[PDB]
């Protein structure tokens, strides 16, 4: 009983036994630890794409940058991660500077909102400003 949670949510005679005898004498032919270490390399799920998505309050999360520039820098970061994972000074399998011209690709970013406009001012401040424009006070 009383199981823990990963995330917070709302709350802030004689037995001779001649059968078995387990000692030794077989080695793993591709190798147990090596094949299962490859398996726990492959087991991990995909990391999330939370860019250009609303947060709790409603503002689009992520950095303010052009969509195409963010896609190209994201391919650059994947190439550098591939280089660090193959442990060379240059990733042999590269994701950027390929022969394919891909000057129209766009990965999502925090520049554009859900309605279709820019995020120079966040949506919470825009709504608060558009409703603080029309107020009225008590007379003197």
């Amino acid at each position: 009983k009383r199981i823990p949670r990963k995330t917070k949510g709302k709350s802030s005679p004689a037995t001779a036994e001649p059968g078995t005898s387990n000692c030794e004498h077989y080695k793993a032919r591709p190798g147990i630890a090596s094949v299962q270490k490859a398996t726990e390399s492959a087991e991990l799920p995909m990391k999330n794409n939370d860019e250009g998505t609303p947060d709790k309050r409603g503002n689009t999360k992520g950095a303010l940058v052009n969509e195409h520039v963010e896609a190209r820098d994201e391919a650059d970061d994947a190439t550098k991660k591939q280089a660090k994972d193959t442990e060379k000074a240059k990733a042999q399998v590269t994701y950027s500077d390929t022969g394919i011209n891909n000057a129209n690709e766009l990965s999502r970013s925090g520049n554009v909102d859900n309605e279709g406009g820019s995020n120079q001012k966040p949506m919470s401040t825009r709504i608060a400003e558009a409703t603080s424009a029309i107020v009225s006070k008590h007379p003197a």
């Binding site: 190798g31 630890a33 090596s34 270490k37 442990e87 060379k88």
Partner: protein
């Protein structure tokens, strides 16, 4: 092998006494950052190991033949410790040992 060659004395003279043979780590133990303890501290320069036991797990295969790229990165980290902080101390040590007799190192 030093204990075996210690106990030989043919014609009253001892053949290879212990008193003037130099062990491999005697030049390493006289330094104040004490070289083996100095190269235990190599793991902080490497980005993603940040522990000695994690380093010894990471360099190996779990077969005890190591990967070549981990040895290459650790050797690039290791070569300034062996060229700068070892060689002049070794010059002073082997010069001192050559001054105090004719020895075997």
């Amino acid at each position: 092998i030093m204990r075996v060659l210690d106990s030989i004395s043919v014609l009253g003279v001892k053949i290879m006494p212990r008193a003037h043979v130099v062990d491999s780590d005697e030049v390493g133990e006289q330094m104040e950052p004490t070289f083996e303890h100095a190269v235990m501290e190599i793991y902080k320069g490497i980005a993603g190991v940040d522990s000695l036991d994690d380093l010894t797990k990471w360099v190996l295969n779990s077969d005890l033949v190591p990967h070549d790229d981990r040895l290459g990165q650790l050797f690039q980290a290791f070569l300034p410790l062996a060229k700068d902080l070892l060689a002049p101390m070794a010059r002073q040590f082997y010069d001192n040992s050559m001054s105090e007799g004719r020895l075997l190192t």
